Amino acid sequence: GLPRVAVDLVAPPLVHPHSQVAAGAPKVVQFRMSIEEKKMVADDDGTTAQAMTFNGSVPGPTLVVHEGDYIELTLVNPATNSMPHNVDFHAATGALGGAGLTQVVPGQEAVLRFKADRSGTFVYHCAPAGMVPWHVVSGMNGALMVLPRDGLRDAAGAALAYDRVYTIGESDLYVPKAADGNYSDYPALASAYADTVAVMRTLTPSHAVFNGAVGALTGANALTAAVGESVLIIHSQANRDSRPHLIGGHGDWVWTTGKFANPPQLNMETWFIPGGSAAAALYTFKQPGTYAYLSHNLIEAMELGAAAQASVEGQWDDDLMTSVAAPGPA
Numbered sequence: 001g002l003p004r005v006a007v008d009l010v011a012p013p014l015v016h017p018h019s020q021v022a023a024g025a026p027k028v029v030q031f032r033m034s035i036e037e038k039k040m041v042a043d044d045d046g047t048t049a050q051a052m053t054f055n056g057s058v059p060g061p062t063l064v065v066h067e068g069d070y071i072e073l074t075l076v077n078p079a080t081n082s083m084p085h086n087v088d089f090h091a092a093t094g095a096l097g098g099a100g101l102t103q104v105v106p107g108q109e110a111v112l113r114f115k116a117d118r119s120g121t122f123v124y125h126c127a128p129a130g131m132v133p134w135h136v137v138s139g140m141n142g143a144l145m146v147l148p149r150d151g152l153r154d155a156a157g158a159a160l161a162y163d164r165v166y167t168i169g170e171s172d173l174y175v176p177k178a179a180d181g182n183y184s185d186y187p188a189l190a191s192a193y194a195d196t197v198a199v200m201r202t203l204t205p206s207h208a209v210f211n212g213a214v215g216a217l218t219g220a221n222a223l224t225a226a227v228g229e230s231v232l233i234i235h236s237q238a239n240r241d242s243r244p245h246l247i248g249g250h251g252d253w254v255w256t257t258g259k260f261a262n263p264p265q266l267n268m269e270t271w272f273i274p275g276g277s278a279a280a281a282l283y284t285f286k287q288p289g290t291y292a293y294l295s296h297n298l299i300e301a302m303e304l305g306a307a308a309q310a311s312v313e314g315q316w317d318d319d320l321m322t323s324v325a326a327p328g329p330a
């Protein structure tokens with residue numbers, strides 16, 4: 001030389017713791033882681049897944065820281081586981097982130113460282129090579145955151161714150177188934193891867209868721225818171241885207257993207273985120289119760305898953321518302 005620281009871580013958702021613102025310164029831281037892977041479961045038924053893561057868871061853791069510172073871481077792976085991982089982151093720168101470096105494988109470880117610167121929330125995440133895505137888616141891653149220183153614121157310135165936171169894451173896833181348808185388962189892882197891848201491619205897823213598962217957150221778991229418170233948330237895723245948312249518530253513030261620186265826105269519702277890344281947112285618450293957271297789409301958330309838851313617491317018122325018446329028838 002520176003110172004350183006360480007831381008712890010925791011787981012888711014938651015975161016850891018821381019612161020925102022411161023014163024112180026720167027530183028470194030550381031952481032560780034581980035891764036784981038496983039498986040788981042897712043848902044318820046059972047378923048488962050495987051896954052992966054870182055620690056364990058888803059898602060892863062977260063871381064935171066611131067711106068400146070640185071861271072460282074370580075891673076581881078274980079071985080046990082197987083695978084490887086690583087881581088991447090976001091944040092850172094280069095390488096890538098770282099991744100390459102870281103790577104690782106198983107066992108181983110590584111460480112780384114870185115720174116941161118920137119712120120816110122962112123895513124880491126795995127991867128590885130080839131594977132990456134696977135990972136891331138597974139798971140993974142877450143876130144870281146850163147823151148610124150011171151714290152937151154618104155637109156114107158013112159310141160713111162818251163319280164718391166948471167975271168968530170888411171895732172997506174894928175697973176596968178076978179033939180018858182268923183778913184597937186495985187055991188281992190590887191086986192697973194292839195287937196887843198295938199578924200993735202386709203893209204779608206399955207588932208988504210947140211954291212892882214478905215548920216987771218828721219118950220127990222778921223988350224928581226218260227018314228017043230515030231818361232923151234964160235878321236894441238890675239891958240894818242887513243968206244876220246928451247428911248019731250818303251946112252317030254935121255951122256988404258997340259870153260822171262720117263411113264934121266416010267118110268828203270838802271947112272977104274994217275995927276990868278993360279974111280954141282814131283818221284617160286018122287018323288118470290428950291718530292838831294977631295895403296919205298628803299378916300995814302518911303168906304797938306894513307878502308968641310938361311718771312818251314317280315018281316119521318019436319015025320616002322019522323019823324017146326119632327229814328018636330016567």
Ligand SMILES: O=N[O-]
Pocket residue numbers: none
């Ligand atoms: O896992 N890249 O944010």
Ligand SMILES: [Cu+2]
Pocket residue numbers: 085126135140
């Ligand atoms: Cu992993």
Ligand SMILES: [Cu+2]
Pocket residue numbers: 090125276
């Ligand atoms: Cu990433």
